[PDB]
Amino acid sequence: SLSCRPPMVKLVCPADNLRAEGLECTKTCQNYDLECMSMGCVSGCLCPPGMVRHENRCVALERCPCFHQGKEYAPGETVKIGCNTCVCQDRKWNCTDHVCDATCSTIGMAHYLTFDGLKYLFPGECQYVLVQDYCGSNPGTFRILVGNKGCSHPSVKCKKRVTILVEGGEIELFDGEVNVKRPMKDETHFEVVESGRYIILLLGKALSVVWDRHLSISVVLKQTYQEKVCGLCGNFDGIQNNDLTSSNLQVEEDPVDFGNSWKVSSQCADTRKVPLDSSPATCHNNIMKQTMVDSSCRILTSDVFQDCNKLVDPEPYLDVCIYDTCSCESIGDCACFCDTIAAYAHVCAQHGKVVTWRTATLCPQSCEERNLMENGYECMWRYNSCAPACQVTCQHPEPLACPVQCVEGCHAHCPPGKILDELLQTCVDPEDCPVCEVAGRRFASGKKVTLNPSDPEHCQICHCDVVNLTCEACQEPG
Amino acid sequence: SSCRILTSDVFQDCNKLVDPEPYLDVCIYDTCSCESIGDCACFCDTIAAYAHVCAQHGKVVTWRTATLCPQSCEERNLMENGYECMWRYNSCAPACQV
Amino acid sequence: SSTARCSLFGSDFVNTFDGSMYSFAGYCSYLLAGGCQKRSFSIIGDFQNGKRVSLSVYLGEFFDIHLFVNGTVTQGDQRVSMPYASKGLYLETEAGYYKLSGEAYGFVARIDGSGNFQVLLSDRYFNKTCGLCGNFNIFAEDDFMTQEGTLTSDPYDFANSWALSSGEQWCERASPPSSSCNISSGEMQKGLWEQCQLLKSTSVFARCHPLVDPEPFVALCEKTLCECAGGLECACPALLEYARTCAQEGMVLYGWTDHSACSPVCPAGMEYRQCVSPCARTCQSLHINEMCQERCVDGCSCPEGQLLDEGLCVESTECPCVH
Amino acid sequence: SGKRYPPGTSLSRDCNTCICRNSQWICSNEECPGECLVTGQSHFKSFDNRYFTFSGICQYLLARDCQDHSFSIVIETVQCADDRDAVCTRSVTVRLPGLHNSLVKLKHGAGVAMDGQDVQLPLLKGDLRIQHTVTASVRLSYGEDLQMDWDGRGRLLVKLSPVYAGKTCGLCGNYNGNQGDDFLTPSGLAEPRVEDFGNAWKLHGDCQDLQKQHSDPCALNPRMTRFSEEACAVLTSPTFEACHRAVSPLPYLRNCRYDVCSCSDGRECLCGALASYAAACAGRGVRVAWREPGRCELNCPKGQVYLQCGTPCNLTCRSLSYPDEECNEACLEGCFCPPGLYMDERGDCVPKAQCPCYYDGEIFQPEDIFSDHHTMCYCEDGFMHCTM
Ligand SMILES: *[C@@H]1O[C@H](CO)[C@@H](O)[C@H](O)[C@H]1NC(C)=O
Ligand SMILES: *[C@@H]1O[C@H](CO)[C@@H](O)[C@H](O)[C@H]1NC(C)=O
Ligand SMILES: *[C@@H]1O[C@H](CO)[C@@H](O)[C@H](O)[C@H]1NC(C)=O
Ligand SMILES: *[C@@H]1O[C@H](CO)[C@@H](O)[C@H](O)[C@H]1NC(C)=O
Ligand SMILES: *[C@@H]1O[C@H](CO)[C@@H](O)[C@H](O)[C@H]1NC(C)=O
Ligand SMILES: *[C@@H]1O[C@H](CO)[C@@H](O)[C@H](O)[C@H]1NC(C)=O
Ligand SMILES: [Ca+2]
Ligand SMILES: [Ca+2]
Ligand SMILES: [Ca+2]
Ligand SMILES: [Ca+2]
Ligand SMILES: [Ca+2]
């Protein structure tokens, strides 16, 4: 025997009531809203009706925590998931309803991550519609495309070509640089930020693009659309299983037949339904090599990623690591491996988890060739783990709408009172910028735009090429 | 093809002195066998073994770029909170020093 | 110490890393040792019907060797020759007895001519490897922690938790053998009690007692002296283990087989020495020294001269050449 | 699906129909029933067609009506083999506050127990019907908005009609279409780590919550690594060519290799996972013929015969007693016997000559003349011929 503790009472099965929900139905905080089984009570001791058990302590009140990530949270404690806060107002967190900015991706050579979140496989070779707006019953503002060449089997080959069509423009990029073929009308929203590895690329109030100079395509949209698009990335509705709505307006099941609907040239090659197997071409019947790639792809589950393993499931980004490098014959450039983890590291950073996983025996990424032109070696450049992408320059002095928090890559750092210019690879004082301030108001560094098209009478134009304190005359219509 | 860096425009001085046909046959022998995945060191090491021999005959070479066997040196200028950055990867510096 | 030792000596008997014996007449494969949180390897032992056949080392996922008394070692299903050294696993023969070394992976296995599996294992897996040779801890009573993790009182169902099956054969719960000794008692317990007893009486064994205790060793023999008919040699298996167990502890014994009337089997030309060097100076050998500072190991070896050449002892004069 | 159709055609998904007009399939958006599923060791499926895994050992909730309380289901999980990564289902509990607030319990056989009392099948109470399906699997049916399936060796199913749209809460999710929110703990927030979701629906505090859900238990049993490859490599082999264009096979492959390595006997674990795929291929329309003497053909007794697609309406002898009742059943798979033979209670099947009657429950022999003072009744060949 044992006379149980004061705050709780010994209970006894009655001989009449089958509903002896006693010791077997031991209400804790987890099981309270839940419903419990019971045949009959036992010779145990049990908290009162308006009180429960809590890690060997019969906590008095209904104030016990509101578990997330298997961790305690007192009532009123808050968390940040995505762009939203959320507080357990009682026993149940009630979260806000500000929908966050979704994000496509092209992880490796042949995979695609939709907005709602859906990894799928599509080795293509033709040109394909990554995403657009001209979908059914809408105007058709922007028509981002993607085009691959020799990329059905991932390898050191597969240089991408990206042609994006907005505001009647044609700007496209491949082989490291961007190229304008047709400038768009509203040059005002246009913006390009070559910060670090990336080419961040705004196009409006509700659009943005990113490019790691090698393969990754990560277009970023805002709250504005909410089911106004279609293409490979799907519809951007929150519903995740309707991201296989082909151009002929139905859901498929085999994504290799999905993307074949979205190709541009309707007479080029539709890709071939591969026999599914966990080993690609090289790893097929080469079990040895598979385990050296398997292990080396377990960096995605390593001690340094343990923070991000909790938030972002690595099981998607893992299966790509094993798929590419089997196919890819990495010889001199191990980039068909090194690029897949950075595609995981960046997503870890967007959730606020910086990581430094890159060492000298493993995908080094020097930055020393830039501190070379100058005979003096000031070396202000550095491979900073994850630095901000939207900083201030002689070319872009103002603070820009910043869709990406930070980014890996080589970044400048010199003492303050010196601001960067890209043409002269070194940083420099503010006054050496070709900055423009005409008739007082603060604006950009002399953008090449014709202001005030609205009002003829008020047509008081003031351009500025580099520094000039000039104002042109408007040509009258009469 | 990728082993023909041993016959490239930058090695043209050393191609005259040191026959690359030996060091070539190794480049093709190893990396066939070697399943380079994360570390492309079973390729990057064979050319340095040719570059060093080119240097011993007085022919420095800078063949190492960012898309090709980078060899950063930046982790060392890290312990100090101040970033003096006095360390550098360069061509071929005196093997001996004080 | 910095090492460990398991042994499956004689018929169905076991010796864990911590002085805990029992008997087990298995029926299929069973896990000897290996990690429990994560396995870089796994030593495995196959039993045909109670009696043992094979040692096996599966090195994660991709590589497999299946050595045995048959000696016809194989890699997967293709029978290979011997010796063999792939994947950091030298598969050698030492002192006329077969060896499997994994020093990178921290283990050394071997077998003798009769068939007595042995497993030497580093101190790196202290409180790790949980299996049929038990954990490498200090204690010896708690080293039955099942594949669930459950301290059990039975040394039998434990070994059945650590079973592992194939597509070639799925295996079941083996049964303990029904002992026929229970009726055929007769004189066999009165005359043959001495060979188990001489572990305690004879002076050559009368000095490991501050290091070990023969009380289990004498306990496990008395149940196996009863099935074999007409032989004192039935005691020397349980006795032969006690020699090595004291040797591993840092205190060796000498010449005990001189009067014991049982010597372990070896091929022609050699008989059981004690503490022979592993680096047996053979015929087609390079005369180099003071690299083999390895510890001293038991096993049969050639006479004073009579150098080795291809699994036999041959006189030094008749050393051949090769081309 | 990589093939052409002329205009004006109308193909039909399981959910609804779609028609081709000007290279644009038009489609309806009317809801269609969901299916939570438990099978294998620990492999779940949400109503929103999510897949995941949670190898917890306690009494977990599975589904519940959450704006009103028309029902509530509770699974009970246990370790089920030597490994730690093998947690099969033992028993599920069902609860109906609309009828006595009773408590049904499906047990590890094909048995059932209402309030502790074992019960013979069928069990026509007012609303809920419980009857065998192939005489090897129970099928609860409460109302017309609820079904179930056998929890003997752990292949629990459900069928919820769209009247429960978005108004349930449990491991199986909201039943709202959205595949993402389904990791929403009872405290009202979407969790990313599954190890937090499943342990958030446990019923007993003493149960240990786990910390890591392992994905490759074949490491702890390296012997099965080979066999798990060639075995479920038939899942992608063109034997199942017909329903790669019906449902994604990649998880039904992923859930094999976790079972064949983990469970005590990989023979049936294999051949209870392949059928998990065929059963969903058939739920959309595609039947497959994947049985062989090697690939686990079941052994129908000598009275019965194997059959692929058949009619469980004209099989049981109870059918001739109640022929008027509707049998709006599908073309199922199992052990039947030829049409001249109908099923007897004792495992053999028999012609309709000695097929008894089940009048008022009472099992009358093939010739039993039978009468009170005022009625007059007899059993001829299965049917009960009453007069007055
Ligand atoms: C959450 O609930 C609290 C308490 O009812 C309320 O004050 C608050 O406005 C709610 N917030 C959201 C985002 O719904
Ligand atoms: C570089 O990274 C370090 C370490 O995260 C940080 O302390 C520092 O502010 C960064 N500097 C720049 C210029 O981004
Ligand atoms: C500024 O613009 C005027 C035109 O009004 C032009 O003549 C002058 O060269 C420009 N100056 C600079 C520095 O660009
Ligand atoms: C590279 O090193 C060489 C040899 O020490 C030296 O002459 C040269 O100035 C260095 N160049 C740079 C860019 O550091
Ligand atoms: C044993 O070895 C012999 C000779 O190589 C071989 O014929 C036989 O099949 C082997 N048996 C086993 C058990 O492997
Ligand atoms: C051995 O491991 C167990 C389980 O992790 C732990 O509880 C115990 O403290 C460890 N003991 C030693 C001696 O390290
Ligand atoms: Ca969608
Ligand atoms: Ca922040
Ligand atoms: Ca010189
Ligand atoms: Ca022990
Ligand atoms: Ca849902």
Side-chain angles (χ1 to χ4, degrees), chain A residues 1-41 43-158 160-478, chain B, chain C residues 1-189 191-240 242-280 282-323, chain D residues 1-244 246-301 303-388:
Chain A
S1 296
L2 188 153
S3 296
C4 64
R5 299 293 297 165
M8 70 284 198
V9 176
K10 73 288 192 185
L11 276 295
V12 176
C13 292
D16 192 0
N17 297 115
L18 72 164
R19 295 291 303 281
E21 291 183 353
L23 191 282
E24 293 180 353
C25 182
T26 302
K27 291 182 182 179
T28 186
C29 294
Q30 300 300 112
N31 62 5
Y32 183 76
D33 292 331
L34 297 175
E35 191 274 330
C36 63
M37 281 65 256
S38 179
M39 284 63 257
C41 69
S43 178
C45 189
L46 183 66
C47 292
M51 191 182 291
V52 297
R53 297 294 297 168
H54 186 271
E55 287 78 3
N56 193 2
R57 183 78 280 282
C58 186
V59 65
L61 277 296
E62 295 82 3
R63 65 183 181 179
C64 66
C66 301
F67 293 98
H68 176 72
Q69 292 179 358
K71 183 174 86 273
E72 188 273 331
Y73 293 99
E77 294 293 328
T78 62
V79 298
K80 186 180 288 294
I81 189 165
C83 64
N84 290 319
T85 187
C86 188
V87 51
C88 178
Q89 49 79 22
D90 183 7
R91 292 182 184 273
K92 304 161 303 306
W93 311 74
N94 64 310
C95 305
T96 62
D97 193 358
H98 296 285
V99 64
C100 298
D101 296 331
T103 301
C104 297
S105 178
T106 300
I107 299 92
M109 289 71 170
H111 292 89
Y112 293 102
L113 182 63
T114 61
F115 294 107
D116 295 327
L118 182 63
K119 183 174 72 66
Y120 63 92
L121 182 63
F122 182 73
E125 289 173 347
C126 292
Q127 184 176 1
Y128 294 100
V129 177
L130 183 62
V131 66
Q132 66 182 358
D133 193 359
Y134 183 76
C135 191
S137 66
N138 290 318
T141 61
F142 64 93
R143 292 179 183 175
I144 294 168
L145 277 72
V146 64
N148 58 8
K149 65 184 289 295
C151 194
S152 65
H153 294 285
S155 65
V156 298
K157 185 173 71 176
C158 180
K160 298 289 180 69
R161 184 175 291 171
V162 176
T163 60
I164 59 172
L165 281 71
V166 66
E167 291 179 353
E170 181 66 25
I171 189 169
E172 61 88 19
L173 60 87
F174 64 93
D175 194 359
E177 295 295 329
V178 64
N179 297 115
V180 178
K181 299 295 290 184
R182 295 179 65 251
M184 65 184 179
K185 293 181 180 180
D186 189 358
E187 183 64 25
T188 62
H189 295 89
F190 182 76
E191 180 61 24
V192 176
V193 177
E194 181 175 1
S195 66
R197 294 181 297 119
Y198 291 170
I199 301 299
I200 298 91
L201 190 153
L202 283 72
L203 295 171
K205 183 176 174 66
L207 183 62
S208 296
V209 176
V210 178
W211 180 59
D212 65 356
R213 186 175 290 171
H214 189 268
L215 294 173
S216 70
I217 302 298
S218 178
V219 64
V220 176
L221 279 69
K222 299 293 185 182
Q223 188 271 329
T224 302
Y225 294 95
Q226 294 295 112
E227 188 176 1
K228 298 295 290 183
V229 298
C230 62
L232 293 174
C233 288
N235 62 6
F236 182 74
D237 62 357
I239 302 299
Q240 181 176 358
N241 62 4
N242 64 6
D243 286 330
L244 294 174
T245 60
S246 64
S247 296
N248 60 5
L249 278 295
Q250 65 186 352
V251 176
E252 291 180 353
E253 65 280 14
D254 194 358
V256 66
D257 293 330
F258 179 74
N260 288 319
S261 67
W262 292 97
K263 65 176 74 67
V264 175
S265 66
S266 178
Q267 60 85 28
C268 69
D270 57 355
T271 184
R272 180 71 273 173
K273 295 184 287 294
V274 65
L276 283 74
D277 58 356
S278 66
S279 65
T282 303
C283 290
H284 182 71
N285 297 117
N286 191 358
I287 190 166
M288 185 278 288
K289 184 261 182 68
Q290 163 56 36
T291 61
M292 292 180 181
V293 65
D294 189 359
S295 66
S296 67
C297 290
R298 298 296 296 165
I299 301 300
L300 294 175
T301 303
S302 178
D303 292 330
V304 64
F305 292 168
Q306 297 294 322
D307 190 359
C308 182
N309 297 118
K310 295 180 177 67
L311 278 296
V312 177
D313 190 358
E315 190 275 332
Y317 295 93
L318 189 151
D319 293 331
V320 178
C321 183
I322 64 172
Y323 181 78
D324 291 332
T325 58
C326 288
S327 69
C328 176
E329 296 294 328
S330 66
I331 297 166
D333 190 359
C334 292
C336 58
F337 180 79
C338 298
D339 290 331
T340 62
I341 297 168
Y344 182 77
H346 186 270
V347 174
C348 296
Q350 296 297 108
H351 293 86
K353 280 74 175 174
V354 65
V355 179
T356 301
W357 62 271
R358 187 182 293 274
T359 186
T361 188
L362 182 64
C363 305
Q365 184 64 42
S366 180
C367 301
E368 293 180 353
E369 291 82 3
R370 189 179 294 110
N371 289 316
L372 189 284
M373 152 74 223
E374 185 179 1
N375 296 114
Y377 184 76
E378 327 178 305
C379 204
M380 97 255 1
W381 291 96
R382 297 181 295 177
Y383 184 68
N384 200 285
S385 183
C386 196
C390 56
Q391 69 276 17
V392 298
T393 60
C394 294
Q395 294 79 13
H396 298 288
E398 68 276 17
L400 277 299
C402 190
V404 177
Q405 285 71 241
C406 67
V407 299
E408 296 177 354
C410 303
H411 295 286
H413 188 273
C414 63
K418 290 177 72 68
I419 302 298
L420 182 63
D421 58 355
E422 291 82 4
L423 296 173
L424 296 173
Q425 64 185 359
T426 191
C427 61
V428 67
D429 291 330
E431 69 276 16
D432 291 330
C433 300
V435 65
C436 293
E437 293 180 354
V438 66
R441 75 281 192 190
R442 178 71 274 173
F443 64 89
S445 177
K447 64 182 182 294
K448 279 73 177 175
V449 177
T450 301
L451 277 297
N452 190 1
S454 66
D455 192 358
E457 292 83 3
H458 184 72
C459 189
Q460 183 61 255
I461 194 67
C462 294
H463 292 90
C464 182
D465 290 330
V466 297
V467 177
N468 37 1
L469 183 64
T470 189
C471 295
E472 294 83 3
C474 295
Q475 296 293 322
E476 293 179 353
Chain B
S1 66
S2 67
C3 290
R4 298 296 296 165
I5 301 300
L6 294 175
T7 303
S8 178
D9 291 331
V10 65
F11 292 168
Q12 296 294 322
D13 190 359
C14 182
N15 297 118
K16 295 180 177 67
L17 278 296
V18 177
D19 190 358
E21 190 275 332
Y23 295 93
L24 189 151
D25 293 331
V26 178
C27 183
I28 64 172
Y29 181 78
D30 291 332
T31 58
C32 287
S33 69
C34 176
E35 296 294 328
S36 66
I37 297 166
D39 190 359
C40 292
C42 58
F43 180 79
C44 298
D45 291 331
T46 62
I47 297 168
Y50 182 77
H52 186 270
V53 174
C54 296
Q56 296 297 108
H57 293 86
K59 280 74 175 174
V60 65
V61 179
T62 301
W63 62 271
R64 187 182 293 274
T65 186
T67 188
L68 182 64
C69 305
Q71 184 64 42
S72 180
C73 301
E74 293 181 353
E75 291 82 3
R76 188 179 294 110
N77 289 316
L78 189 284
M79 305 345 274
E80 185 179 1
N81 296 114
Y83 183 76
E84 319 181 332
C85 195
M86 290 348 261
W87 287 95
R88 297 187 302 181
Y89 184 82
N90 184 9
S91 309
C92 196
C96 50
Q97 75 288 344
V98 297
Chain C
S1 66
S2 68
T3 61
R5 183 263 181 91
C6 180
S7 176
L8 282 72
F9 62 91
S11 295
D12 298 330
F13 292 166
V14 176
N15 186 0
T16 62
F17 293 164
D18 295 327
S20 296
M21 292 72 165
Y22 63 90
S23 180
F24 181 75
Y27 182 76
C28 68
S29 172
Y30 294 96
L31 182 64
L32 278 295
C36 300
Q37 185 65 41
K38 77 288 287 181
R39 290 181 184 175
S40 66
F41 62 89
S42 66
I43 297 95
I44 295 169
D46 193 359
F47 294 168
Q48 184 66 43
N49 50 359
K51 293 187 287 185
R52 65 178 65 88
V53 176
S54 71
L55 189 149
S56 298
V57 176
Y58 294 168
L59 185 61
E61 295 279 323
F62 62 97
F63 183 75
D64 48 359
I65 297 184
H66 320 87
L67 71 86
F68 33 47
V69 179
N70 201 2
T72 63
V73 296
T74 179
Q75 189 274 331
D77 59 356
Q78 297 293 320
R79 186 178 63 247
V80 297
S81 67
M82 184 180 73
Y84 181 77
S86 294
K87 270 64 185 298
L89 294 174
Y90 296 96
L91 182 63
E92 294 177 353
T93 185
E94 293 293 329
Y97 289 166
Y98 296 161
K99 182 174 74 172
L100 188 153
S101 68
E103 293 179 353
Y105 295 98
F107 64 93
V108 177
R110 60 91 56 80
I111 61 170
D112 62 355
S114 67
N116 291 318
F117 296 166
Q118 183 175 0
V119 176
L120 294 174
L121 192 150
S122 179
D123 59 356
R124 186 177 63 245
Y125 301 94
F126 188 104
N127 199 17
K128 285 70 173 301
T129 169
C130 67
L132 185 62
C133 296
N135 58 9
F136 182 70
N137 61 0
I138 303 299
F139 293 167
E141 67 278 17
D142 61 356
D143 64 353
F144 290 163
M145 294 294 171
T146 58
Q147 187 169 357
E148 295 175 353
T150 58
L151 73 164
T152 60
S153 66
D154 190 358
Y156 182 77
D157 61 357
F158 180 77
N160 208 155
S161 179
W162 293 96
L164 299 172
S165 63
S166 65
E168 294 293 328
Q169 63 91 32
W170 292 267
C171 67
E172 66 279 16
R173 294 182 182 273
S175 296
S178 65
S179 66
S180 66
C181 297
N182 297 115
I183 191 70
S184 66
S185 66
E187 191 271 330
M188 294 177 72
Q189 292 81 20
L192 295 173
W193 181 65
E194 294 178 353
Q195 294 83 18
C196 288
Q197 185 64 41
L198 61 85
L199 281 73
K200 188 180 287 294
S201 72
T202 60
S203 66
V204 65
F205 293 102
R207 72 285 302 281
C208 293
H209 294 85
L211 276 297
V212 298
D213 293 331
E215 293 293 329
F217 293 97
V218 300
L220 60 84
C221 69
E222 292 177 353
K223 66 184 288 186
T224 186
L225 275 299
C226 59
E227 67 279 17
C228 64
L232 60 87
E233 67 275 16
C234 295
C236 66
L239 188 152
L240 181 64
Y242 182 76
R244 292 190 295 268
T245 58
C246 185
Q248 189 272 328
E249 294 291 328
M251 184 270 166
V252 66
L253 73 164
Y254 293 98
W256 61 267
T257 186
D258 191 0
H259 65 279
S260 179
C262 182
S263 66
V265 64
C266 281
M270 297 182 284
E271 63 278 17
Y272 182 76
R273 284 86 171 89
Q274 191 284 126
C275 186
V276 65
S277 178
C279 298
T282 185
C283 175
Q284 293 179 354
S285 65
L286 191 152
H287 295 89
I288 187 162
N289 59 2
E290 60 94 22
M291 60 81 67
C292 188
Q293 298 294 321
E294 294 179 353
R295 291 183 291 112
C296 188
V297 177
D298 60 352
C300 53
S301 297
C302 292
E304 184 63 25
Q306 292 80 16
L307 295 173
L308 189 150
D309 189 0
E310 295 292 328
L312 60 87
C313 304
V314 64
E315 183 63 24
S316 178
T317 302
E318 291 79 359
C319 262
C321 305
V322 64
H323 182 74
Chain D
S1 68
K3 66 184 287 186
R4 183 262 189 194
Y5 293 98
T9 59
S10 179
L11 60 84
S12 66
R13 294 179 67 189
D14 61 350
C15 189
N16 59 3
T17 60
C18 294
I19 297 95
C20 178
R21 292 180 182 176
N22 297 114
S23 295
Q24 293 182 357
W25 292 97
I26 60 170
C27 294
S28 67
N29 59 3
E30 61 92 21
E31 294 293 329
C32 53
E35 297 89 0
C36 188
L37 188 150
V38 179
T39 186
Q41 297 292 320
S42 178
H43 298 290
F44 293 172
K45 180 175 76 69
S46 71
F47 292 110
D48 295 327
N49 290 317
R50 186 168 183 179
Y51 297 158
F52 64 94
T53 300
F54 181 80
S55 297
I57 295 167
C58 197
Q59 293 179 356
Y60 294 99
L61 188 146
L62 184 67
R64 182 177 183 270
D65 193 353
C66 300
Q67 62 90 31
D68 60 351
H69 299 286
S70 64
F71 64 93
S72 65
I73 297 168
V74 174
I75 191 164
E76 194 276 330
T77 58
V78 298
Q79 184 170 357
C80 196
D82 295 331
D83 293 328
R84 294 178 65 87
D85 294 332
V87 176
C88 78
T89 305
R90 183 180 72 189
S91 66
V92 64
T93 301
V94 178
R95 184 177 177 84
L96 277 297
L99 295 174
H100 183 75
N101 198 351
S102 67
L103 190 150
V104 177
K105 182 175 174 67
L106 282 71
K107 289 171 95 288
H108 182 75
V112 63
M114 184 180 286
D115 294 330
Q117 297 292 323
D118 293 331
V119 176
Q120 292 178 357
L121 281 73
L123 182 61
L124 189 151
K125 185 176 177 183
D127 292 330
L128 72 164
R129 284 80 59 81
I130 297 170
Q131 67 276 16
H132 295 285
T133 300
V134 68
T135 64
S137 60
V138 65
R139 180 178 290 172
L140 190 149
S141 177
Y142 181 75
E144 65 278 16
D145 297 331
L146 190 283
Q147 299 290 321
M148 299 297 287
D149 199 356
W150 58 273
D151 194 2
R153 299 290 299 163
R155 190 179 170 80
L156 185 63
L157 280 74
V158 298
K159 300 296 294 297
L160 278 294
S161 67
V163 65
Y164 294 99
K167 63 177 74 66
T168 186
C169 60
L171 294 175
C172 300
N174 291 318
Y175 185 70
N176 59 2
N178 191 358
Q179 184 176 1
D181 62 352
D182 291 332
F183 283 178
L184 76 165
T185 185
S187 58
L189 188 153
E191 293 178 350
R193 187 176 74 189
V194 65
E195 292 86 359
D196 295 322
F197 181 73
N199 65 10
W201 293 93
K202 66 181 181 180
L203 293 174
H204 293 170
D206 61 356
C207 297
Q208 295 180 356
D209 56 354
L210 59 86
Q211 286 71 237
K212 291 182 182 179
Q213 184 65 40
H214 294 88
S215 179
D216 186 73
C218 302
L220 295 173
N221 185 355
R223 290 176 71 84
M224 295 298 291
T225 60
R226 183 180 63 80
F227 181 77
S228 67
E229 192 275 331
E230 291 88 7
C232 283
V234 299
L235 189 151
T236 184
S237 179
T239 60
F240 294 96
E241 184 63 25
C243 66
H244 293 89
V247 64
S248 65
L250 182 63
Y252 293 98
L253 182 63
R254 186 176 66 247
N255 297 323
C256 171
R257 296 178 66 252
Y258 182 80
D259 292 335
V260 65
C261 291
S262 296
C263 71
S264 66
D265 190 359
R267 293 180 180 176
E268 68 274 17
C269 298
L270 181 64
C271 306
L274 295 174
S276 67
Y277 182 71
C281 292
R284 297 292 299 275
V286 177
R287 64 101 181 83
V288 178
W290 61 271
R291 300 294 178 90
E292 285 188 354
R295 293 188 288 114
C296 296
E297 64 185 0
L298 77 164
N299 54 0
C300 300
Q304 293 82 16
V305 64
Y306 181 76
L307 191 147
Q308 184 65 43
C309 198
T311 60
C313 178
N314 291 318
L315 182 65
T316 186
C317 189
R318 185 176 180 272
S319 66
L320 296 174
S321 67
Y322 294 164
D324 60 354
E325 294 292 328
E326 68 275 16
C327 57
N328 290 318
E329 294 293 328
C331 180
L332 281 72
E333 190 274 330
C335 294
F336 293 169
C337 71
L341 281 294
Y342 293 168
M343 189 66 199
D344 194 359
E345 293 181 354
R346 297 294 87 194
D348 194 357
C349 66
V350 297
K352 67 185 289 296
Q354 66 274 21
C355 191
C357 295
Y358 294 165
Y359 182 76
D360 196 357
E362 292 176 352
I363 298 92
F364 293 101
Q365 296 294 320
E367 295 86 3
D368 289 329
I369 296 90
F370 182 77
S371 65
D372 294 330
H373 296 286
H374 64 282
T375 186
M376 185 68 206
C377 293
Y378 63 94
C379 179
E380 184 176 1
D381 56 358
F383 182 75
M384 192 73 208
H385 296 285
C386 277
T387 63
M388 296 298 290

